[PDB]
Design a protein around this ligand. Sequence first.
Ligand SMILES: CC(=O)N[C@H]1[C@H](Oc2ccccc2-c2cccc(C(=O)O)c2)O[C@H](CO)[C@H](O)[C@@H]1O
Length: 153
Amino acid sequence: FSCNVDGGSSIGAGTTSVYVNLDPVIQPGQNLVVDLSQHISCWNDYGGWYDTDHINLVQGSAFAGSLQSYKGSLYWNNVTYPFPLTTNTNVLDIGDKTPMPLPLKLYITPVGVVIKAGEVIARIHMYKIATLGSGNPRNFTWNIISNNSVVMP
Ligand SMILES: CC(=O)N[C@H]1[C@H](Oc2ccccc2-c2cccc(C(=O)O)c2)O[C@H](CO)[C@H](O)[C@@H]1O
């Protein structure tokens, strides 16, 4: 099982930065939408649904400290959860070689410069396990980072 960000190099595990464009100006209590399907894609390294991969997002995934007061929601594979995640999400199953954009969207409600360019706004923990043998479990963390400043007069 592997993933990439913006069509980049393969990722087997670990923490990866995910840069996203945010609305440069928002008024309280305006809502920000972050479509991560436009950045993160994953695939089965064998294909043919031989050793199918099973992916879910993990309890504890949340906004990044400085934004710990923010309210939000996390859409994942046909279900919309409250964010930060208080439970593990449903399982998405991957068995094709062709990259699958993650069906993943983050809805943010903030509670001058609100968010800094280069600032981690959220950390999404993703868990993988396959079908054959032990399934070779692996952990991914997607550090969502803003490409631009977000202000709020
Ligand atoms: C061990 C291991 O991950 N098995 C995976 C297997 O991983 C690979 C298969 C072929 C080439 C490379 C990898 C690969 C990718 C990333 C990390 C590692 C690693 O060493 O941990 C291996 O892929 C299968 C279907 O995708 C299952 O996920 C199975 O559990």
